[PDB]
């Protein structure tokens, strides 16, 4: 099986910042997971990578010249993107994998979320 992903269809960044919540159909409390944000239709660029611990600790990484921050919450991960450029207006996709406790699962392709940076 696969995890489900609900993300807002549209978000306007105000003052070059936005909060992208990725809603999963899985209990990420006390789980070893790896959440991802990808930008672009071809999902090439990986914007942010939020690794989750069993003891609900987070290791957030911002890879491609993005200012990313991460917050965990039950069946969701929130990506707080700051200092976005206007030229970064695009479709963003939430990705997830759970490893422990088993089984290993990944997400079914989400519809994405259009971020308009103003």
């Amino acid at each position, epitope marked *: 099986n696969k995890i489900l992903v609900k993300q807002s269809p549209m978000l306007v960044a105000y003052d070059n910042a936005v909060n992208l919540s990725c809603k999963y159909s899985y209990n990420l*409390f006390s789980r*070893e997971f*790896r959440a*991802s944000l990808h930008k672009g239709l071809d999902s090439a660029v990986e914007v942010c990578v939020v*690794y989750g611990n069993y003891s609900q600790q987070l290791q957030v990484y911002s890879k491609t010249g993005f200012n990313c921050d991460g917050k965990l919450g039950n069946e969701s991960v929130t990506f707080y993107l700051q200092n976005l450029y206007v030229n970064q207006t695009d479709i963003y996709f939430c990705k997830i*994998e759970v490893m422990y*406790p*088993p*089984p*290993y699962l990944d997400n079914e392709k989400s519809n994405g979320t259009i971020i308009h940076v103003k």
Partner: antibody, heavy 116, light 114 residues
Framework: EVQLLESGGGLVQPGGSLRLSCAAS????????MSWVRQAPGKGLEWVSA????????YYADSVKGRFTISRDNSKNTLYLQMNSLRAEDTAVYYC?????????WGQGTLVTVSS | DIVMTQSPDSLAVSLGERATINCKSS????????????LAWYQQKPGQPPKLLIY???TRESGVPDRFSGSGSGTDFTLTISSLQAEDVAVYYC?????????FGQGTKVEIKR
């Protein structure tokens, strides 16, 4: 028929490096987490490391941290283990295992002997 | 650092009679979210790679006979072979898969008493 076939083991000097491989068939390799489990001759099983179906998440045992690296090529259906800075203690039969709720399938094993 | 301790180290039981192996976890491997205990049992015959028998403490793997049965929750667990067969002489291992690093018990050697 699911098959896991290990290779790359044998005799190596202490301090030296060895790379193990585990080829898979008979299932969608990229859909499952893989592990390496080792068993020293006449001893119990010791979990070594695990890698997600995608390769994005890797975990390691306390004893092998900083020395061993678990990787995979889903296009080749092969799982790798890069053992560096080997010690005598690392001598064991190295199994590769497919996970789903537990280790539901195990390979035959490849014998790594670390000795001068 | 979740430690698994089995008992006994060795066990000899007559053909057809009941065998019991205990496995004690140093921390509760009961996941409160789905009430499942993340504990597995393997059988390892000599010179052969291990074989999964039980997972989620009591759920029996495809093709494992009715006689193997896992039981317990939290920290103490039990594997039961109702009617020991000749083909069951192996070393049994318990294993937690709740959190990394995954850890195994020391193993229990089961023998036929004759």
């Amino acid at each position: 028929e699911v098959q896991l076939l290990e290779s790359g083991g044998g005799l190596v000097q202490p301090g030296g490096s060895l790379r193990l491989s585990c080829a898979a068939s008979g299932f969608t390799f990229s859909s499952y987490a893989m592990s390496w489990v080792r068993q020293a001759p006449g001893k119990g099983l010791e979990w070594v490391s695990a890698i997600s179906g995608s390769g994005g998440s890797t975990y390691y045992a306390d004893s092998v941290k900083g020395r061993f690296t678990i990787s995979r090529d889903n296009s080749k259906n092969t799982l790798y283990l890069q053992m560096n800075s080997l010690r005598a203690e690392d001598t064991a039969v190295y199994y590769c295992a497919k996970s789903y709720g537990a280790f539901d399938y195990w390979g035959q094993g490849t014998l790594v002997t670390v000795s001068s | 650092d979740i430690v698994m301790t089995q008992s006994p180290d060795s066990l000899a039981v007559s053909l057809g009679e009941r065998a019991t192996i205990n496995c004690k976890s140093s921390q509760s491997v009961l996941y409160s979210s789905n009430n499942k205990n993340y504990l597995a049992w393997y059988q390892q015959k000599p010179g052969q790679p291990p074989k999964l028998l039980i997972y989620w403490a009591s759920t029996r793997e495809s093709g494992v006979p009715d006689r193997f049965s896992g039981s317990g929750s939290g920290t103490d667990f039990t594997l039961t072979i109702s009617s020991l067969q000749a083909e069951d002489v192996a070393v049994y291992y318990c294993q937690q898969n709740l959190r990394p690093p995954e850890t195994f018990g020391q193993g229990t050697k089961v023998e036929i008493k004759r």
